[model samples]
Target: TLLINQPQYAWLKELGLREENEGVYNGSWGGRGEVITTYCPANNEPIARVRQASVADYEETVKKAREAWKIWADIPAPKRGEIVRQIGDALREKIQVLGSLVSLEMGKILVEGVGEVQEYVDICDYAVGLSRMIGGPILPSERSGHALIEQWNPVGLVGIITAFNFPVAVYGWNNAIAMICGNVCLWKGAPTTSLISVAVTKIIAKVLEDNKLPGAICSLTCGGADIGTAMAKDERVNLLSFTGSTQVGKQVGLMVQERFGRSLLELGGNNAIIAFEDADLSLVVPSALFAAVGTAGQRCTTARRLFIHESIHDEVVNRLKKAYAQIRVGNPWDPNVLYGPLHTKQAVSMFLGAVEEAKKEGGTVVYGGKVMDRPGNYVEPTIVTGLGHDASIAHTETFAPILYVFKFKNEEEVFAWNNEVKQGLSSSIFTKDLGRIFCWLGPKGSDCGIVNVNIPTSGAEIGGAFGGEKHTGGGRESGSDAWKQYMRRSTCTINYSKDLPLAQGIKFQ
Candidate 1:
């Protein structure tokens, strides 16, 4: 059974998520619109009923963010990083409680919840080190007594759109870097995850207040598509960072571009793991299992396709069947529960529909394929076999713990068909064969932002730039120059001599 601690009344009232009428938000919390009640997917229990942010409230939030950015932008990068450090400190104090809310609300297991909170902490630590490293490169100018350099500046207020699957970590990735870059953030979080959003936002707001910062340094507005649309279209927001489906990402990116604003989009992913002939089953099975079953396989980088060598096809398949037999699907709060419920009944429906299509289109169910008889959106972690690449299910990317296994004899056998999808977020190849690894990682490699060897597709670390290609929106975040997305670049030139010279030596009298 799942468990939840009683929510703190003090923060709840102050945040205006509860005990308030006409919920018009002042700055961060208190919104007056239609009420949205969210539930714990763990056991189909009620979590919180909060009022959505109205159009009026959106303007008020943006107004506060705009005001805050002016003051925040003036702060030195390292100084801003210090403030982020303080935020991390505050988050550390609430790790246990906040992590629980994430699990209960988001349906990820307890360990994942704790790991998600740690992701926020990890980025804060990374951004602090990155603060001093934001210095740019110097280049020799062609003109005499002249030097060239580059500087980065804040891009004004940032609009953040996070998905339910990673409500805290995704926002954490953007907030830490954006803050260090001297930008304020306005988060319109996933509607299905309003409670966790409000909870995390309150923690962030406190850090700002303790440091004599404006409330707009970090703000939240919880709602549906209306709120998402409003934030994407708001001109005051200079750069918008959005994470969700490819379809939504396209619309948001287009709208931002239409207004001449920039957008950082982390969209959908149809990740795959290519298991070569020399792959080890011990590592391959566990890695693939976690990648496909973790978070109920709802992650953007969840391994959807598995290309296994035909030599060990039966051995690997039988081993997976035996391994999956001992798996446990239950409440996330339970430490021993390996698999949890889907975020909603709709998710379960989509999983079932996709499997039905797989069956109708010539795929065979090799393992579990049924939803549970329990309350909540509990469903079996399924495995389907011999799914043709042309099958509708083979091409589709459904957010569930459903694995589709395909056989491949050699490296070139699965290359053409592996990447034939609209969403390309993450892909990997598992093999001990160094020659094959190079070929897979070379020019004609797995075409995704995150390419791994002998590693799972999910559970990406904070050290690397994380995002996808093609329909995946091509935005990088977290680390490894991803901080560039949050700031604007300006070229600088200085002359020691009292002379003005143009580059390329264009002579004009």
Candidate 2:
């Protein structure tokens, strides 16, 4: 039985979701493709159905989005930011219901779902301030009677393709920045979370309509790989911002590069959390548990590897096991529940397979390694010890709650081990040594986009540029100069005198 019509689940309707919802939005709502039903991972029951988009639907939506951009780009940056501020307020109005939909459909906990919405709201505020501040500096001209300055302009249509792990926040990070930069967005969210996609778009569309702006300014086209590949290859789509696995992102990058179009990739991460011997066990134990198991370890920044100094390795593991046992597990939206099921059954299978692979590679499952005997895609949050830092299974980025524990004897070796992985999204160290902390953050430190001291690897702040080095994809979003990625810069020089002087004292005939 579907749950959208239930009285207790009336929050779904608050998001403007129907049992069978249109999955395409280009100032209007429609789709000419297959109908896919999305289910709740907590109980494996159908939540709602979304009619996916076809080639024609995507083409029309993109065209309208580019058309909308011409009008949108003409608005002043502050005015555009005013629209974004309204969007933030609109999202604030429905944060609870929208977050419940995210939890029911995407399988992350209620607080995290609400927190994800808050991140978008926060970034909207950040982008609002950034709008008035987004400009290049005036440079001193070397030539006599000349002024030099830099100008930034929007890159037409921005196509955003987000993964299921963070459907709303990732899109919001790009949208708030891109919109404030005078660009229009055409979103193709994860098909599995199509309802969440539709609901969020409705809120934004209302904001756009109330302002008498074209709805295509923030379009939505829901589908799978076909729509995603189309967005990657479309020439009209000036910049494609993709967030997903490394394997798929590489292909998306190639397609965009082939067309000579811009692409911002937020790919996979095999993040790490290292605990030195002098570290506080109270801090290390809970930090590792939350970073590794939060959202069932679906976060791209999830801590897949934990390195404890050999002197206190077993003790940390023992304390971590005790903490894991105390975790509250149940439905994601239910209050007081700390854990939920994987987003998909395939992820559960992947989790089990990774655990088995670790055992085969000389690792012992210390805490949990079995699938939970439940109705949905539930699995025990697992911890495996006795694995080398260089173990093949340990190095691979598996998107599940299977933390590989390793024992390191020295700082040099452990830091090397942390950087050895191809994906360098996030890294953290739990230590009080002043020199050690500085060294970790120094020139030869943890080589990741988000590096921290005395904190867990997950739950990054929105103020920093979020992304990574190596295979984690160098694209950054949310804050800092990340807005530069969405816009093109041009350097201009004006000659105010009758005679123009060449630079470097060169004379022209």
Model 1 C-alpha lDDT per residue in residues 117-167, reported as the tens digit of each score: 999998999999999898678988887888898988889988899999998
lDDT of 2 by residue, 166-220 (tens): 9899999999999999999999999999999999999999999999999999999
TM-score of model 1 (CA atoms):
0.94
* Candidate lDDT (C-alpha), each: 0.83, 0.93
* TM-score of every model versus the real structure: 0.94, 0.98
By TM-score, who's the top model here?
A: 2
Q: lDDT: which candidate is best?
A: 2
